Amino acid sequence: LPDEVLKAAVDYSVQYIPQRSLPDKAIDLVDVTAAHLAAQHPVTDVHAVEREIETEKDKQEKAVEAEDFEAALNYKTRIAELERKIENHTEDMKVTASVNDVAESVERMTGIPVSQMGASDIERLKDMAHRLQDKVIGQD
Amino acid sequence: LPDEVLKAAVDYSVQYIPQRSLPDKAIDLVDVTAAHLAAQHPVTDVHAVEREIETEKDKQEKAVEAEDFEAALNYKTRIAELERKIENHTEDMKVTASVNDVAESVERMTGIPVSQMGASDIERLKDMAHRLQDKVIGQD
């Protein structure tokens, strides 16, 4: 994660979760952020070809038993093929650390949608005047 | 051995070794005949290449361990090469059954050179008259 996301997580956890110490909460927010950013992606799209590599490896061993070197060489070439394909899929990871994603993580934490996310405490300590004022009637 | 050599061996053992039964002596004469006809030939002329095949086989196993199939294939080809060479040498056996060779086997058995080998008993029973007559003087 780039530093901007990190400082944003700190600034949010400090102002929204005062009931916990800083060092642990800042870490836990990041941790759950990453877990969610896994986006519940599957692994079958590589797992199937892992099975394929296993089968090809077994046939390669069988051919080696019969000392048929051309077939074993072909099998090894196919093994390399599938291997670096899987390598290509593995690096198909999304790298998107956004302050916004941390924000929805917070919202799931506390159930509170935040308008004007990232606003200064200076902003918030004055805006809450209306926040309560506009959910009540008078009695200013 | 062709039948002629066999009957010749029988005819010689019957007339020159009466102090033994027929069936065993006829066999033993043939046996010693063959052993001598081995002519004390060596086996190094194939044994060396047997060692060579052993060394090439070890290198072939080593290359198979490293899964270098071209080298193992070359090694197997060389193994076949040396193998059928050794096959060619193995069939380089002399096939010469001669009544004469049986005769020298007899001579080694009893120390008696035989003039007129294969002569009939009819010949021999009359020729021995001179055989003794000419080694003695008169007294016919």
Side-chain angles (χ1 to χ4, degrees):
Chain A
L1 290 113
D3 291 352
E4 307 61 10
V5 185
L6 319 176
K7 65 178 66 63
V10 166
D11 298 345
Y12 294 160
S13 71
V14 67
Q15 66 179 270
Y16 292 116
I17 312 296
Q19 60 277 41
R20 207 188 323 295
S21 304
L22 167 61
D24 269 356
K25 71 186 182 187
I27 301 299
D28 282 356
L29 204 47
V30 172
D31 186 58
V32 160
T33 311
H36 183 77
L37 289 186
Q40 291 173 3
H41 280 125
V43 295
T44 304
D45 297 332
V46 66
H47 174 242
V49 176
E50 305 276 354
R51 293 194 307 275
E52 300 317 273
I53 278 181
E54 287 307 299
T55 300
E56 298 286 299
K57 187 265 173 172
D58 175 80
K59 274 200 300 176
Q60 181 262 332
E61 175 182 2
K62 275 327 313 175
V64 174
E65 184 284 337
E67 291 88 11
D68 283 276
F69 304 116
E70 72 305 348
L73 185 70
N74 302 338
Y75 284 137
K76 288 297 186 175
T77 310
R78 301 285 60 63
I79 285 164
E81 183 52 45
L82 304 171
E83 185 289 318
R84 23 190 221 2
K85 185 273 291 179
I86 281 170
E87 195 64 1
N88 297 336
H89 286 358
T90 311
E91 290 182 354
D92 189 8
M93 80 167 175
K94 65 189 171 310
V95 297
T96 344
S98 170
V99 301
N100 316 333
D101 314 330
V102 178
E104 294 90 7
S105 302
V106 172
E107 285 177 335
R108 294 192 303 283
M109 203 39 96
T110 63
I112 306 306
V114 176
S115 62
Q116 300 300 295
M117 293 172 186
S120 82
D121 50 325
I122 298 91
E123 303 177 55
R124 296 191 299 274
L125 300 176
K126 311 287 309 216
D127 294 332
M128 73 183 56
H130 283 150
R131 292 181 185 187
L132 272 296
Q133 181 65 68
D134 309 338
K135 295 176 186 176
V136 306
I137 303 168
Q139 307 194 36
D140 61 301
Chain B
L1 290 113
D3 291 352
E4 307 61 10
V5 185
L6 319 176
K7 65 178 66 63
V10 166
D11 298 345
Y12 294 160
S13 71
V14 67
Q15 66 179 270
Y16 292 116
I17 312 296
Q19 60 277 41
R20 207 188 323 295
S21 304
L22 167 61
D24 269 356
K25 71 186 182 187
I27 301 299
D28 282 356
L29 204 47
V30 172
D31 186 58
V32 160
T33 311
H36 183 77
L37 290 186
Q40 291 173 3
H41 280 126
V43 295
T44 304
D45 297 332
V46 65
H47 174 242
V49 176
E50 305 276 354
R51 293 194 307 275
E52 300 317 273
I53 278 181
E54 287 307 299
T55 300
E56 298 286 299
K57 187 265 173 172
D58 175 80
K59 274 200 299 176
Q60 181 262 332
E61 175 182 2
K62 275 327 313 175
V64 174
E65 184 284 336
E67 291 88 11
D68 283 276
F69 304 116
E70 72 305 348
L73 185 71
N74 302 338
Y75 284 137
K76 288 297 186 175
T77 310
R78 301 285 60 63
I79 285 164
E81 183 52 45
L82 304 171
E83 184 289 318
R84 23 190 221 2
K85 185 273 291 179
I86 281 170
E87 195 64 1
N88 297 336
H89 286 358
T90 311
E91 290 182 354
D92 189 8
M93 80 167 175
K94 65 189 171 310
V95 297
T96 344
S98 170
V99 301
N100 316 333
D101 314 330
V102 178
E104 294 90 7
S105 302
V106 172
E107 285 177 335
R108 294 192 303 283
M109 203 39 96
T110 63
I112 306 306
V114 176
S115 62
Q116 300 300 295
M117 293 173 186
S120 82
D121 50 325
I122 298 91
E123 303 177 55
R124 296 191 299 274
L125 300 176
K126 311 287 309 216
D127 294 332
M128 73 183 56
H130 283 150
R131 292 181 185 187
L132 272 296
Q133 181 65 67
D134 308 338
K135 295 176 186 176
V136 306
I137 303 168
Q139 307 194 36
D140 61 300

Coordinates of all heavy atoms in Angstrom, one line a residue, chain A residues 29-94:
Chain A
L29 N -7.4 -2.0 11.0 CA -8.1 -1.4 9.9 C -7.4 -1.7 8.5 O -8.1 -2.1 7.6 CB -8.1 0.2 10.0 CG -9.3 0.8 9.3 CD1 -10.6 0.0 9.6 CD2 -9.5 2.2 9.7
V30 N -6.1 -1.7 8.5 CA -5.4 -2.0 7.3 C -5.6 -3.5 6.9 O -5.9 -3.9 5.8 CB -3.9 -1.7 7.4 CG1 -3.1 -2.3 6.3 CG2 -3.7 -0.2 7.6
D31 N -5.6 -4.3 8.0 CA -5.7 -5.8 7.7 C -7.1 -6.1 7.1 O -7.2 -6.8 6.1 CB -5.5 -6.5 9.1 CG -5.5 -8.0 8.9 OD1 -4.7 -8.5 8.1 OD2 -6.4 -8.7 9.5
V32 N -8.2 -5.6 7.7 CA -9.5 -5.9 7.2 C -9.6 -5.2 5.8 O -10.3 -5.8 5.0 CB -10.6 -5.4 8.2 CG1 -11.9 -5.3 7.5 CG2 -10.7 -6.5 9.3
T33 N -9.0 -4.1 5.6 CA -9.0 -3.5 4.3 C -8.5 -4.4 3.3 O -9.1 -4.6 2.2 CB -8.2 -2.2 4.4 OG1 -8.6 -1.4 5.5 CG2 -8.5 -1.4 3.1
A34 N -7.3 -5.0 3.5 CA -6.7 -5.9 2.6 C -7.6 -7.1 2.4 O -7.8 -7.5 1.2 CB -5.3 -6.3 3.0
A35 N -8.1 -7.7 3.4 CA -8.9 -8.9 3.3 C -10.1 -8.6 2.4 O -10.5 -9.4 1.6 CB -9.4 -9.4 4.7
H36 N -10.8 -7.5 2.6 CA -11.9 -7.1 1.7 C -11.4 -6.9 0.3 O -12.1 -7.3 -0.6 CB -12.6 -5.9 2.3 CG -13.8 -5.5 1.5 ND1 -15.0 -6.2 1.6 CD2 -14.0 -4.6 0.5 CE1 -15.9 -5.7 0.7 NE2 -15.3 -4.7 0.1
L37 N -10.3 -6.2 0.1 CA -9.8 -6.0 -1.2 C -9.4 -7.3 -1.9 O -9.2 -7.2 -3.1 CB -8.6 -5.0 -1.2 CG -8.9 -3.6 -0.8 CD1 -7.7 -2.7 -1.0 CD2 -10.1 -3.1 -1.7
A38 N -9.3 -8.4 -1.2 CA -9.2 -9.6 -1.9 C -10.4 -9.8 -2.8 O -10.4 -10.7 -3.7 CB -9.1 -10.8 -0.9
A39 N -11.5 -9.1 -2.5 CA -12.7 -9.1 -3.4 C -13.2 -10.5 -3.6 O -14.0 -10.7 -4.6 CB -12.4 -8.4 -4.7
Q40 N -12.9 -11.4 -2.7 CA -13.4 -12.8 -2.7 C -13.2 -13.5 -4.1 O -14.0 -14.2 -4.6 CB -14.9 -12.8 -2.4 CG -15.2 -12.4 -1.0 CD -16.7 -12.2 -0.7 OE1 -17.6 -12.5 -1.6 NE2 -17.1 -11.9 0.5
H41 N -12.0 -13.2 -4.6 CA -11.6 -13.8 -5.9 C -11.4 -15.3 -5.8 O -10.8 -15.7 -4.8 CB -10.5 -13.1 -6.5 CG -10.8 -11.8 -7.2 ND1 -10.2 -10.6 -6.9 CD2 -11.7 -11.5 -8.1 CE1 -10.7 -9.6 -7.6 NE2 -11.7 -10.2 -8.4
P42 N -11.7 -16.1 -6.8 CA -11.5 -17.5 -6.7 C -10.1 -17.8 -7.1 O -9.2 -17.0 -7.4 CB -12.5 -18.0 -7.7 CG -12.6 -16.9 -8.7 CD -12.5 -15.7 -7.9
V43 N -9.8 -19.1 -7.1 CA -8.5 -19.6 -7.6 C -8.6 -20.8 -8.5 O -7.6 -21.3 -9.0 CB -7.6 -20.0 -6.3 CG1 -7.3 -18.8 -5.5 CG2 -8.3 -21.1 -5.5
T44 N -9.8 -21.2 -8.9 CA -10.0 -22.3 -9.8 C -9.4 -21.9 -11.2 O -8.8 -22.8 -11.9 CB -11.5 -22.6 -10.0 OG1 -12.0 -22.9 -8.8 CG2 -11.6 -23.8 -11.0
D45 N -9.4 -20.7 -11.6 CA -8.9 -20.3 -12.9 C -7.4 -20.6 -13.0 O -6.9 -20.5 -14.2 CB -9.2 -18.8 -13.1 CG -10.6 -18.5 -13.0 OD1 -11.4 -19.4 -13.4 OD2 -11.0 -17.3 -12.6
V46 N -6.7 -20.9 -12.0 CA -5.4 -21.4 -12.0 C -5.3 -22.8 -11.5 O -4.5 -23.6 -11.9 CB -4.4 -20.5 -11.2 CG1 -4.7 -20.5 -9.8 CG2 -3.0 -20.9 -11.4
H47 N -6.3 -23.2 -10.6 CA -6.3 -24.5 -9.9 C -6.5 -25.6 -11.0 O -5.9 -26.7 -10.9 CB -7.3 -24.5 -8.8 CG -7.5 -25.9 -8.2 ND1 -8.7 -26.5 -8.3 CD2 -6.6 -26.6 -7.5 CE1 -8.6 -27.7 -7.6 NE2 -7.3 -27.8 -7.1
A48 N -7.4 -25.3 -11.9 CA -7.6 -26.3 -13.0 C -6.3 -26.7 -13.7 O -6.0 -27.9 -13.9 CB -8.6 -25.8 -14.0
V49 N -5.5 -25.7 -14.1 CA -4.3 -25.9 -14.8 C -3.2 -26.5 -13.9 O -2.3 -27.3 -14.3 CB -3.8 -24.7 -15.5 CG1 -2.5 -24.9 -16.2 CG2 -4.9 -24.2 -16.5
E50 N -3.3 -26.3 -12.6 CA -2.5 -27.0 -11.7 C -2.8 -28.5 -11.7 O -1.9 -29.4 -11.8 CB -2.7 -26.5 -10.2 CG -2.4 -25.1 -10.1 CD -0.9 -24.7 -10.0 OE1 -0.1 -25.7 -9.9 OE2 -0.6 -23.5 -10.0
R51 N -4.1 -28.9 -11.8 CA -4.5 -30.3 -12.0 C -3.9 -30.8 -13.3 O -3.4 -31.9 -13.4 CB -6.0 -30.4 -12.0 CG -6.6 -30.2 -10.6 CD -8.0 -30.7 -10.6 NE -8.8 -30.2 -11.7 CZ -9.4 -29.0 -11.7 NH1 -9.3 -28.2 -10.7 NH2 -10.1 -28.6 -12.8
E52 N -4.0 -30.0 -14.4 CA -3.5 -30.4 -15.7 C -2.0 -30.7 -15.6 O -1.5 -31.7 -16.1 CB -3.7 -29.3 -16.7 CG -5.2 -29.0 -16.9 CD -6.0 -30.3 -16.9 OE1 -6.2 -30.8 -18.0 OE2 -6.5 -30.7 -15.9
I53 N -1.2 -29.8 -14.9 CA 0.2 -30.0 -14.8 C 0.5 -31.3 -14.0 O 1.4 -32.1 -14.3 CB 0.9 -28.8 -14.0 CG1 1.1 -27.7 -15.1 CG2 2.1 -29.2 -13.3 CD1 1.8 -26.5 -14.5
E54 N -0.4 -31.6 -13.0 CA -0.2 -32.9 -12.3 C -0.4 -34.1 -13.2 O 0.4 -35.0 -13.2 CB -1.2 -32.9 -11.1 CG -0.8 -32.0 -10.0 CD 0.6 -32.3 -9.6 OE1 0.9 -33.4 -9.1 OE2 1.4 -31.3 -9.7
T55 N -1.4 -34.0 -14.0 CA -1.7 -35.2 -14.9 C -0.5 -35.3 -16.0 O -0.1 -36.4 -16.2 CB -3.0 -35.0 -15.7 OG1 -4.1 -34.9 -14.7 CG2 -3.3 -36.1 -16.6
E56 N -0.1 -34.2 -16.5 CA 1.0 -34.3 -17.5 C 2.3 -34.7 -16.9 O 3.0 -35.5 -17.5 CB 1.2 -32.9 -18.1 CG 0.0 -32.4 -18.9 CD -0.2 -33.0 -20.2 OE1 0.8 -32.9 -21.1 OE2 -1.2 -33.7 -20.4
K57 N 2.5 -34.4 -15.6 CA 3.7 -34.9 -14.9 C 3.6 -36.4 -14.7 O 4.6 -37.1 -14.8 CB 3.8 -34.1 -13.5 CG 5.0 -34.4 -12.7 CD 4.8 -35.5 -11.7 CE 6.1 -35.9 -11.1 NZ 5.8 -36.9 -10.0
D58 N 2.4 -36.9 -14.4 CA 2.3 -38.3 -14.2 C 2.6 -39.1 -15.5 O 3.3 -40.0 -15.5 CB 0.9 -38.7 -13.7 CG 0.7 -40.2 -13.7 OD1 1.2 -40.8 -12.7 OD2 0.1 -40.7 -14.6
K59 N 2.0 -38.6 -16.6 CA 2.3 -39.2 -17.9 C 3.8 -39.1 -18.3 O 4.4 -40.0 -18.9 CB 1.5 -38.6 -19.0 CG 0.1 -39.2 -19.1 CD -0.5 -38.9 -20.5 CE -0.6 -37.4 -20.7 NZ -1.1 -37.0 -22.1
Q60 N 4.4 -38.0 -17.9 CA 5.8 -37.8 -18.1 C 6.7 -38.8 -17.4 O 7.6 -39.4 -17.9 CB 6.3 -36.4 -17.8 CG 7.7 -36.1 -18.0 CD 8.5 -36.3 -16.7 OE1 8.0 -36.1 -15.6 NE2 9.8 -36.6 -16.9
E61 N 6.3 -39.0 -16.1 CA 7.0 -40.1 -15.3 C 6.8 -41.5 -16.0 O 7.7 -42.3 -16.1 CB 6.5 -40.1 -13.9 CG 7.0 -41.2 -13.1 CD 6.5 -41.3 -11.7 OE1 5.6 -40.4 -11.4 OE2 6.9 -42.1 -10.9
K62 N 5.6 -41.7 -16.4 CA 5.3 -43.0 -17.1 C 6.2 -43.2 -18.3 O 6.8 -44.3 -18.5 CB 3.8 -43.1 -17.5 CG 2.8 -43.6 -16.4 CD 3.3 -44.6 -15.3 CE 4.1 -45.8 -15.9 NZ 4.6 -46.6 -14.8
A63 N 6.3 -42.2 -19.2 CA 7.1 -42.3 -20.3 C 8.6 -42.5 -20.0 O 9.3 -43.2 -20.6 CB 6.9 -41.1 -21.3
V64 N 9.0 -41.8 -18.9 CA 10.4 -41.9 -18.5 C 10.6 -43.4 -18.1 O 11.7 -43.9 -18.3 CB 10.7 -40.9 -17.4 CG1 12.1 -41.2 -16.8 CG2 10.7 -39.5 -17.9
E65 N 9.6 -44.0 -17.4 CA 9.8 -45.4 -17.1 C 10.1 -46.2 -18.3 O 10.9 -47.2 -18.2 CB 8.5 -45.9 -16.3 CG 8.6 -47.3 -15.8 CD 8.5 -48.4 -16.9 OE1 7.9 -48.1 -17.9 OE2 8.9 -49.5 -16.6
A66 N 9.4 -45.9 -19.4 CA 9.6 -46.7 -20.6 C 10.8 -46.1 -21.5 O 11.0 -46.6 -22.6 CB 8.4 -46.7 -21.5
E67 N 11.5 -45.1 -21.0 CA 12.7 -44.6 -21.6 C 12.5 -44.1 -23.0 O 13.3 -44.2 -23.9 CB 13.8 -45.7 -21.6 CG 14.4 -46.0 -20.3 CD 13.6 -47.1 -19.6 OE1 12.8 -47.7 -20.2 OE2 13.9 -47.3 -18.4
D68 N 11.3 -43.5 -23.2 CA 11.0 -42.8 -24.5 C 11.2 -41.4 -24.3 O 10.4 -40.6 -23.9 CB 9.5 -43.1 -24.8 CG 9.3 -44.6 -25.4 OD1 9.6 -44.8 -26.6 OD2 9.0 -45.4 -24.6
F69 N 12.4 -41.0 -24.7 CA 12.9 -39.6 -24.4 C 12.3 -38.5 -25.1 O 12.1 -37.4 -24.6 CB 14.4 -39.6 -24.6 CG 15.2 -40.7 -23.9 CD1 15.9 -41.6 -24.6 CD2 15.2 -40.7 -22.5 CE1 16.6 -42.6 -23.9 CE2 15.9 -41.7 -21.8 CZ 16.5 -42.7 -22.5
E70 N 11.8 -38.7 -26.3 CA 11.1 -37.7 -27.1 C 9.8 -37.3 -26.4 O 9.5 -36.1 -26.2 CB 10.9 -38.2 -28.5 CG 9.8 -39.3 -28.7 CD 10.1 -40.5 -27.9 OE1 11.2 -40.7 -27.3 OE2 9.1 -41.3 -27.8
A71 N 9.0 -38.3 -25.9 CA 7.8 -38.1 -25.3 C 8.0 -37.3 -23.9 O 7.3 -36.4 -23.6 CB 7.0 -39.4 -25.0
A72 N 9.0 -37.7 -23.2 CA 9.3 -37.1 -21.9 C 9.8 -35.6 -22.2 O 9.4 -34.7 -21.4 CB 10.4 -37.8 -21.2
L73 N 10.5 -35.4 -23.2 CA 11.0 -34.0 -23.6 C 9.7 -33.2 -23.9 O 9.6 -32.0 -23.5 CB 12.0 -34.1 -24.7 CG 12.6 -32.7 -25.1 CD1 13.5 -32.3 -24.1 CD2 13.3 -32.9 -26.5
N74 N 8.8 -33.7 -24.7 CA 7.6 -33.0 -25.0 C 6.8 -32.7 -23.8 O 6.3 -31.6 -23.6 CB 6.8 -33.8 -26.0 CG 7.5 -34.2 -27.3 OD1 8.4 -33.5 -27.6 ND2 7.1 -35.2 -28.0
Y75 N 6.7 -33.7 -22.9 CA 6.0 -33.5 -21.6 C 6.6 -32.4 -20.8 O 5.9 -31.5 -20.2 CB 5.9 -34.8 -20.8 CG 4.9 -35.8 -21.3 CD1 5.3 -37.1 -21.4 CD2 3.7 -35.4 -21.7 CE1 4.3 -38.0 -21.9 CE2 2.7 -36.3 -22.2 CZ 3.1 -37.6 -22.3 OH 2.2 -38.5 -22.7
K76 N 8.0 -32.4 -20.7 CA 8.6 -31.3 -20.0 C 8.4 -29.9 -20.6 O 8.2 -28.9 -19.9 CB 10.1 -31.6 -19.9 CG 10.4 -32.8 -19.0 CD 10.0 -32.4 -17.5 CE 10.4 -33.5 -16.6 NZ 10.1 -33.1 -15.1
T77 N 8.4 -29.9 -21.9 CA 8.1 -28.6 -22.6 C 6.7 -28.2 -22.3 O 6.5 -27.0 -22.0 CB 8.3 -28.8 -24.1 OG1 9.6 -29.4 -24.4 CG2 8.2 -27.4 -24.8
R78 N 5.7 -29.1 -22.3 CA 4.4 -28.7 -22.0 C 4.3 -28.3 -20.5 O 3.5 -27.4 -20.2 CB 3.4 -29.8 -22.3 CG 3.4 -30.3 -23.7 CD 2.7 -29.4 -24.7 NE 3.2 -28.0 -24.7 CZ 4.5 -27.7 -25.1 NH1 5.3 -28.7 -25.6 NH2 4.9 -26.5 -25.1
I79 N 5.0 -28.9 -19.6 CA 5.0 -28.5 -18.2 C 5.5 -27.1 -18.1 O 4.9 -26.3 -17.3 CB 5.9 -29.5 -17.4 CG1 5.1 -30.8 -17.2 CG2 6.3 -28.9 -16.1 CD1 6.0 -32.0 -16.8
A80 N 6.6 -26.8 -18.7 CA 7.1 -25.4 -18.7 C 6.1 -24.5 -19.2 O 5.8 -23.4 -18.6 CB 8.4 -25.3 -19.5
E81 N 5.4 -24.8 -20.3 CA 4.4 -24.0 -20.9 C 3.3 -23.6 -19.9 O 3.1 -22.5 -19.6 CB 3.7 -24.7 -22.1 CG 2.7 -24.0 -22.8 CD 3.1 -22.6 -23.3 OE1 4.3 -22.5 -23.8 OE2 2.4 -21.6 -23.1
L82 N 2.7 -24.7 -19.3 CA 1.6 -24.5 -18.3 C 2.1 -23.7 -17.1 O 1.4 -22.9 -16.5 CB 1.0 -25.8 -17.9 CG 0.5 -26.7 -19.1 CD1 0.1 -28.0 -18.5 CD2 -0.7 -26.0 -19.8
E83 N 3.4 -24.0 -16.7 CA 3.9 -23.3 -15.6 C 4.0 -21.8 -15.7 O 3.5 -21.1 -14.9 CB 5.3 -23.9 -15.3 CG 6.0 -23.3 -14.0 CD 6.4 -21.9 -14.1 OE1 7.0 -21.5 -15.2 OE2 6.2 -21.1 -13.2
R84 N 4.6 -21.4 -16.9 CA 4.7 -19.9 -17.0 C 3.3 -19.3 -17.3 O 3.1 -18.1 -17.0 CB 5.8 -19.5 -18.0 CG 6.1 -20.5 -19.0 CD 7.3 -20.1 -19.8 NE 7.4 -20.2 -21.3 CZ 6.5 -20.7 -22.1 NH1 5.3 -21.1 -21.7 NH2 6.7 -20.8 -23.4
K85 N 2.4 -20.1 -17.9 CA 1.1 -19.6 -18.0 C 0.5 -19.2 -16.6 O -0.1 -18.2 -16.4 CB 0.1 -20.6 -18.7 CG -1.3 -20.0 -18.9 CD -2.2 -20.2 -17.7 CE -2.5 -21.6 -17.4 NZ -3.4 -21.6 -16.2
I86 N 0.6 -20.2 -15.7 CA 0.1 -20.0 -14.3 C 0.9 -18.8 -13.7 O 0.3 -18.1 -12.9 CB 0.3 -21.3 -13.5 CG1 -0.8 -22.3 -13.8 CG2 0.5 -21.0 -12.0 CD1 -0.6 -23.7 -13.3
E87 N 2.2 -18.7 -14.0 CA 2.9 -17.5 -13.5 C 2.2 -16.2 -14.0 O 2.1 -15.3 -13.2 CB 4.3 -17.6 -14.0 CG 5.3 -16.6 -13.2 CD 5.4 -16.9 -11.8 OE1 4.8 -17.9 -11.3 OE2 6.2 -16.2 -11.1
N88 N 1.8 -16.2 -15.3 CA 1.2 -15.0 -15.8 C -0.1 -14.7 -15.1 O -0.4 -13.6 -14.7 CB 1.0 -15.2 -17.3 CG 2.2 -15.3 -18.1 OD1 3.3 -14.9 -17.6 ND2 2.2 -16.0 -19.2
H89 N -0.9 -15.8 -14.9 CA -2.2 -15.6 -14.1 C -1.9 -15.1 -12.7 O -2.6 -14.2 -12.2 CB -3.0 -16.8 -14.0 CG -3.7 -17.2 -15.3 ND1 -3.6 -16.4 -16.4 CD2 -4.4 -18.2 -15.6 CE1 -4.3 -16.9 -17.4 NE2 -4.8 -18.1 -17.0
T90 N -0.8 -15.6 -12.0 CA -0.6 -15.2 -10.7 C -0.3 -13.7 -10.5 O -0.8 -13.1 -9.6 CB 0.6 -16.0 -10.1 OG1 0.4 -17.4 -10.4 CG2 0.7 -15.9 -8.6
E91 N 0.4 -13.2 -11.4 CA 0.7 -11.7 -11.4 C -0.5 -10.9 -11.9 O -0.4 -9.7 -11.9 CB 1.9 -11.4 -12.3 CG 3.2 -11.9 -11.7 CD 4.4 -11.6 -12.6 OE1 4.2 -11.0 -13.7 OE2 5.6 -11.8 -12.1
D92 N -1.6 -11.6 -12.3 CA -2.8 -10.8 -12.6 C -3.5 -10.5 -11.3 O -4.7 -11.0 -11.0 CB -3.7 -11.6 -13.5 CG -4.9 -10.8 -14.0 OD1 -4.9 -9.6 -13.8 OD2 -5.8 -11.4 -14.7
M93 N -2.9 -9.7 -10.5 CA -3.4 -9.2 -9.2 C -3.7 -7.7 -9.4 O -2.9 -7.0 -10.0 CB -2.5 -9.4 -8.0 CG -1.3 -8.4 -7.9 SD -0.5 -8.5 -6.4 CE 0.9 -7.3 -6.7
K94 N -4.9 -7.3 -8.8 CA -5.2 -5.9 -8.8 C -4.5 -5.1 -7.7 O -4.5 -5.6 -6.6 CB -6.8 -5.7 -8.7 CG -7.3 -6.2 -7.4 CD -8.8 -6.3 -7.4 CE -9.4 -6.9 -6.2 NZ -8.7 -8.2 -5.9

